[PDB]
């Protein structure tokens, strides 16, 4: 065919998408006609979505909320890893707890939804492996010791599983947004680096990720998508 | 705003449009709705897209292009410089000549295009150059001193044009594809035969769909806030540092 | 002024300097001229080197082991650290814990030194924080997503520390050896790399000719992890 | 296993450029090394300290004989330095062919021909140091530089095609990409300052040392931070 290939409708799963650029995600791939599911840490999803209680650094809840999404639509075949905190802090002034929470959940708790979900992905010959990295995983941002590190080794891990995967139709990949609005930021001076000069929109995001999840990505592997209106470009 | 945003019919331009992966490109274009024209060196447009006679090596034939595509649906938004060609050879073995045809056609034939097409970009706020560089610009397929300089100074000129434009809302990326099956008999592919699936992690060489895949998004209303970006479409061929 | 400038004697800390690539960086180092310490885990440094008992994972550990060598040859002034471990296994066959004591000694481990180290450099002016990282950090060697995980998280984590502290002259690189001799089909030089390369890099880094080089990746692989 | 500094070996050396600016601290830091250096130059005569040869980088026949003569005097090069280079900015928007082809022909083209022309006897000796001298524009983009960061970044997609093909004959090729060197802009650079010619001297010197033989293809950014990114 020349034009978009057909469409299937996968089964989604958001980690953190109750909210911010997780919803917008989930709302997107939902419009998209995929079979949508998102994890919340007890307050519950919005209305139209279908929620689970997951907290993602506990390995236990992970392979729970797993076991109800699959046993609503179906075991997981695209995962968007979108859940995430900040502790930022000066280096000398960031404790080993502030360090290691945002290990925990940022580099971490994506690992044990990746490896969770990575049991049917095999069996079935089909996984799309979506993390939410950020500009600061290859720029890093000042006072980000904890999360520039969570962030760059969302690359690292995603290239070790596809180099290992690719060849049973497996693949993880990285969106790495910039300054995303969902304004302390702006004030401090952000936007001198971004040569949109703008932030972005979870929709934008979401944008990103939709393609990632779609039939128009089978050959991505790897990939590091920055939607950062240029500020992330270096090496 | 929650689902896809509205479609808006781009004027689009493909060099080298009339077979290979320009073709897909032009294709997948049109069928997403935009006003697609190509570029040909006799054979003319194919399907029922509009075509211009363009030899990117040829600056005047490149402003002359522009110019009849501006009269048929505006000027160009969407710029896909496709056109490039491979003149391999060792480093003690590659003479000047097929140096700089290489750099000739796929760098600075890329530069001509995304110079041309930069005026009116400015003018209406909105401009997509989107650049077709290959996983050899990063990844340096041996044999390919020429090729591999030409496709990496692709990264390089997005990221300078981005910088400066992105504020105006023009922005420049690059789509990087790994091996990519352009056959047009069943005859197997010589480079499988000489092991390219041994880098290839996918262990499948990629379609010219997908790469024009990763062009409809870059054209789309999904992509205003990328800008300097290398898309790989290799399977994770290229994947390193 | 033309030539090599002046040397300076440095303090330097190599965190698992007692075997492998950590012990020739430290002799490499000491040869130099620098003021050479090593941590080791009870095994013990060679009698010609200073050597302090520390593991990475330990907080307290690390912050005895710096208070150690400021006491015996000034605080740090380059810190190398090398301490890491790898537990390979297939996505689907890694467990949280093969995970996380990957993580916590390869990355938390290194965090917990170059933290306690920039009590005194950013103080002092002068910091050369060099994290010993691998070319499965952006290569992505398979079976590792912890062991890449973490020599990725060394590049974002050197990143962010380099652009709050270069303005301080403390700066943060990472040295990505590829397979060193302690596959080939992926090693464009079609060889293995040796501890002492690796140490060379290392010496550069640590020496008056890198004052200018922030959150860089140095690989050290023979081109194996060539890409992006 | 020796474990200090390698034994030092001395090298035949051509820096491109070595005139004035930066090619010249790299020369003269080569030569304090130990190694025999020539610089290539224009008409204005080379330093009185070097061995100086006519050559200009777009002349692939004034290319092949300052090899000659380089040869003749202490050997064929061992150790190859791409640092002649000009810059020609100007917007995308003003940016004409002419200006964009100049800047081409000699950082990108005229890199290629001294590489191209200094390959054989590396292949033949198995030994090779081809040392291109990039910058950070090439993968961070500078603007007003569509020419300039086009042929710094070509640098890399060379010397890492050279590398993959050449690195098992022992001749590697790298990139070092300086920042602003003093031969607003300190916004982006984390270390507030600017580097000096002796800085990125001092990278090159490394890249040609005999601690850097296992090292191919790689960019070594001599820029305080400025170039980080992806
Ligand atoms: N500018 C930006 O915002 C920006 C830029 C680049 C990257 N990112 C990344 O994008 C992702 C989301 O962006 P955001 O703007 O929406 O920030 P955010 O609002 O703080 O996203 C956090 C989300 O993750 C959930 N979460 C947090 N810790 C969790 C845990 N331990 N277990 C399970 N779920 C947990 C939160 O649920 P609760 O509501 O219950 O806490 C929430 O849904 C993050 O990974 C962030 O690093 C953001
Ligand atoms: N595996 C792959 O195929 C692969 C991988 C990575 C990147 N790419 C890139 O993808 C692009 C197209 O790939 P392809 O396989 O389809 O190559 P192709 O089949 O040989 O066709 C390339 C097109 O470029 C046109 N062209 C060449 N030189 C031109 C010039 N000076 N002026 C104008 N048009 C010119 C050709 O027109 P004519 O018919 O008149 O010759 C042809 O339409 C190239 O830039 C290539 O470098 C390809
Ligand atoms: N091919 C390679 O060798 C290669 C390639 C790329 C990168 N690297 C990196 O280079 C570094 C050293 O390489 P190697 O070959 O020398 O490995 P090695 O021979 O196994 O030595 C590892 C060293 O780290 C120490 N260590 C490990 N865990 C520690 C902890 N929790 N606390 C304190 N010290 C700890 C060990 O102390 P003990 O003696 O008590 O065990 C030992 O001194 C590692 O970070 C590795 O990832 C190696
Ligand atoms: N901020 C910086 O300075 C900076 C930053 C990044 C990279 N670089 C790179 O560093 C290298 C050194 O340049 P520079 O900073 O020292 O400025 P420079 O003073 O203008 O040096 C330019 C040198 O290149 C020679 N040259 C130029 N075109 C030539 C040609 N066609 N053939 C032969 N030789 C030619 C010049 O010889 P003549 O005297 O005859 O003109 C001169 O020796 C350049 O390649 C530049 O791109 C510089």
Redesign the interface.
């Known amino acids: ?5 057909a469409f299937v409708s996968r089964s989604v799963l958001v980690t953190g998408g109750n909210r911010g650029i997780g919803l ?1 995600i989930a ?2 791939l939902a ?2 006609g995929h079979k949508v599911a998102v994890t919340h840490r007890g307050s519950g999803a919005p209305d139209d979505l279908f929620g689970v209680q997951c907290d993602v650094t506990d ?1 236990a809840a992970v392979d729970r909320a797993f076991k109800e999404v699959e046993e609503h639509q179906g075991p997981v075949e695209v995962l968007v890893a979108n859940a995430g905190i900040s502790k930022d802090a ?3 002034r ?1 404790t ?1 707890e502030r ?2 929470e945002v ?1 925990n959940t940022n ?2 708790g994506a ?2 939804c ?2 969770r979900a ?2 049917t992905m ?1 069996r079935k010959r089909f996984g799309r492996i979506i993390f939410i990295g950020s500009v ?32 049973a139709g497996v ?1 993880a990949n990285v969106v ?1 947004p ?1 300054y995303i609005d969902t304004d302390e930021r702006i004030q401090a001076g952000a936007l ?2 971004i ?3 703008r932030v ?2 979870a ?2 995001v979401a ?2 990720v ?2 990632l999840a ?17 500020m ?4």
């Not at 065919?1 to 290939?5: M, S, V």
């Not at 720029?139 to 596809?162: D, E, P, T, V």
């Not at 992330?232 to 090496?235: A, E, K, L, W």
């Open positions: 065919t020349a034009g978009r290939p917008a709302r997107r419009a998209d390995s000066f280096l000398m960031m080993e360090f290691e290990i580099l971490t690992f044990r990746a490896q990575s049991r095999q600061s995983g290859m720029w890093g941002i000042g006072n980000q010791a904890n999360y520039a590190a969570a962030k760059a080794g969302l690359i690292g891990m995603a290239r070790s599983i596809s180099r290992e995967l690719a060849k693949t790495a910039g001198d680096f040569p949109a000069k972005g929109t929709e934008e944008g990103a939709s393609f779609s039939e128009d990505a089978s050959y991505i592997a790897g990939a590091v998508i920055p939607v950062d209106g240029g992330g470009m270096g090496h």
